[PDB]
């Protein structure tokens, strides 16, 4: 209805702002754009479901997230992909892993502080009605 697409539009506006705040953080620069296979050719073999912050923005604008849980699933995917592609003990791998866990922790912490629990519950109940 009108009340419901208004609820989803408010979610989209909130998720855009959060994603922008993540994307401007210097720690998360490596997660801002899709991987260039020219630059890591073995990535395509390893990472079956690639995800990055520009693609998250695109999915927001495409109405793909109806709940914050849908959004955090793709943040979780950015993180798990980074851990999967960078599993080794060497410092380059460890640096990316640390940034990936920090991206995840930061996104969850913003949403805990700033997204009203009743608003998320509303989003979920509309979603389950469709
Ligand atoms: C996002 C990601 O997982 C990622 N991981 C890297 N790891 C490595 O370069 C080394 C340390 N490990 C290894 N090759 N196994 S570089 C990198 C990355 C991807 C981009 O699209 C842009 C960018 O600046 C960096
Ligand atoms: C643009 C980019 O995001 C991307 N570009 C590709 N091809 C290209 O020819 C470039 C050059 S492959 C690729 C990609 C990464 C994955 O981890 C899985 C996957 O299925 C696809």
Curated annotation (Swiss-Prot):
Tissue: Highly expressed in estrogen receptor positive breast tumors and in osteosarcoma tumors.
Residue ranges annotated for the Bromo domain, each copy included: 3-114
Complex formation: Interacts with ESR1 and NCOA3 and these interactions are enhanced by estradiol. Interacts with acetylated lysine residues on histone H1.4, H2A, H2B and H3 (in vitro).
Protein function: May be a transcriptional coactivator of the nuclear receptor ESR1 required to induce the expression of a subset of estradiol target genes, such as CCND1, MYC and E2F1. May play a role in the recruitment or occupancy of CREBBP at some ESR1 target gene promoters. May be required for histone hyperacetylation. Involved in the estrogen-induced cell proliferation and cell cycle progression of breast cancer cells.
Induction of expression: Up-regulated in breast, uterus, colon, ovary, and stomach tumors. Induced in breast cancer cells overexpressing NCOA3 or treated with estrogen. Down-regulated in 5-fluorouracil-resistant derivatives of the colon cancer cell line HCT 116.
Regions annotated as coiled coil: 108-130
Family, as annotated: Belongs to the AAA ATPase family.
This protein's encoding gene: ATAD2
Location(s) in or outside the cell: Nucleus
Record organism: Homo sapiens (Human)
Protein name, as recorded: ATPase family AAA domain-containing protein 2
Included stretch of the parent chain: 981 to 1108 of 1390
């Amino acid at each position: 209805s009108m009340q419901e697409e208004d609820t989803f539009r408010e979610l989209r506006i909130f998720l855009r702002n959060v994603t922008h705040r993540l994307a401007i953080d210097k720690r998360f620069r490596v997660f801002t754009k899709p991987v260039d296979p020219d630059e890591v050719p073995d990535y395509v073999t390893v990472i079956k479901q690639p995800m990055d912050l520009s693609s998250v923005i695109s999915k927001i604008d495409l109405h793909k997230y109806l709940t914050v849980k849908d959004y955090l699933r793709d943040i979780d995917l950015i993180c798990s992909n980074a851990l999967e592609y960078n599993p080794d003990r060497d410092p380059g791998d460890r640096l990316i892993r640390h940034r990936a866990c920090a991206l995840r922790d930061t996104a969850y912490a913003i949403i805990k502080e700033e997204l009203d629990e009743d608003f998320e519950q509303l989003c979920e109940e509309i979603q389950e009605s469709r």
